[PDB]
Amino acid sequence: NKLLRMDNVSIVVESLDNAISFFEEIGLNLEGRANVEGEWAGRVTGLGSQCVEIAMMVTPDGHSRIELSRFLTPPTIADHRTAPVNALGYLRVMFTVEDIDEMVSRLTKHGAELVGEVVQYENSYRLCYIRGVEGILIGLAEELG
Amino acid sequence: AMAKNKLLRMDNVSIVVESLDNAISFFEEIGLNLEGRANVEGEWAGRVTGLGSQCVEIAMMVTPDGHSRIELSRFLTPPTIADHRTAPVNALGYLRVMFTVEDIDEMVSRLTKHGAELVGEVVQYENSYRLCYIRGVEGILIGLAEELG
Numbered sequence: 001n002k003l004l005r006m007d008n009v010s011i012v013v014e015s016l017d018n019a020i021s022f023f024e025e026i027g028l029n030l031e032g033r034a035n036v037e038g039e040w041a042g043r044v045t046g047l048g049s050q051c052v053e054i055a056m057m058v059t060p061d062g063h064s065r066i067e068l069s070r071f072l073t074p075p076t077i078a079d080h081r082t083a084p085v086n087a088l089g090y091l092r093v094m095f096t097v098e099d100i101d102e103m104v105s106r107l108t109k110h111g112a113e114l115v116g117e118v119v120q121y122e123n124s125y126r127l128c129y130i131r132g133v134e135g136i137l138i139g140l141a142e143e144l145g
Numbered sequence: 146a147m148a149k150n151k152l153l154r155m156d157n158v159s160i161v162v163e164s165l166d167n168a169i170s171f172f173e174e175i176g177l178n179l180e181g182r183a184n185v186e187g188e189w190a191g192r193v194t195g196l197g198s199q200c201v202e203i204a205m206m207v208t209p210d211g212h213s214r215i216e217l218s219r220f221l222t223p224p225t226i227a228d229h230r231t232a233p234v235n236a237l238g239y240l241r242v243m244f245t246v247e248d249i250d251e252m253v254s255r256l257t258k259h260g261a262e263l264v265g266e267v268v269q270y271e272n273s274y275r276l277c278y279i280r281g282v283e284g285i286l287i288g289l290a291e292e293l294g
């Protein structure tokens with residue numbers, strides 16, 4: 001077979017509006033919104049009667065996307081947005097930015113919180129884990145040189 | 146456009162798994178390639194995660210187009226203490242990564258042959274896509290799609 005591409009990583013959130021704003025602070029652009037109320041969706045997910053509203057975010061380079069999703073029906077029945085770092089399953093998406101200090105300062109001003117501290121790996125890069133919108137874990141890195 | 150910054154790219158999405166060997170094998174079947182694999186025990190890693198004294202084995206998978214990556218992590222210490230690998234679809238938090246493949250039927254057939262399970266049906270969306278959700282390695286939710294025309 002052939003793997004054409006990794007289209008996107010989806011994240012289920014409580015507020016699409018708040019999620020969109022947070023990711024726009026990171027640098028992604030809102031690419032579109034859609035009220036998915038079809039019945040085919042339910043057939044894919046195995047939920048059946050399903051209505052979800054999504055907002056697709058895309059990075060400036062056009063290669064990566066984040067699909068923000070809010071369930072209307074059926075309502076959500078669990079939450080792992082603030083699971084610990086040492087937990088099995090999806091952990092975080094990592095973004096490389098030009099200036100990690102300015103990004104940490106701006107995000108934190110808007111409510112985000114560092115999980116560890118900003119760390120330098122040799123002379124190659126700097127990175128950190130931060131909890132952003134709705135406590136969701138996100139990684140940030142800066143390439144040195 | 147950000148006055149004092151620039152988003153260069155989304156480097157990767159990472160998944161914490163029980164078996165690095167099995168997870169690597171699974172994503173290889175999906176079509177990603179293994180760039181590297183290593184044990185990381187330097188204290189710097191623990192400062193990032195906030196766990197402190199940690200030892201984790203990491204594996205970096207990259208897509209053929211070279212634009213996307215999946216980082217697989219396995220904790221030696223401290224042990225894991227929570228699991229959302231099999232969280233329901235209608236749950237808050239990271240849900241699934243979606244891959245577009247050449248032939249979804251062959252991929253579904255092959256993956257399920259190796260123990261993966263189709264969540265619902267392989268559905269056709271109008272005249273543009275055919276897609277499904279699959280519980281892959283360790284029940285981890287993945288999305289698959291094939292473009293039509």
Ligand SMILES: N[C@@H](CCC(=O)N[C@@H](CS)C(=O)NCC(=O)O)C(=O)O
Pocket residue numbers: 033034035036053
């Ligand atoms: N922008 C509206 C769009 C609502 C809507 O239903 N749009 C159509 C056209 S993009 C849609 O999403 N159809 C189903 C699909 O393409 O997934 C919103 O805020 O949800």
Ligand SMILES: [Mg+2]
Pocket residue numbers: none
């Ligand atoms: Mg600097």
Ligand code: NA
Pocket residue numbers: 227228229
């Ligand atoms: Na759980």
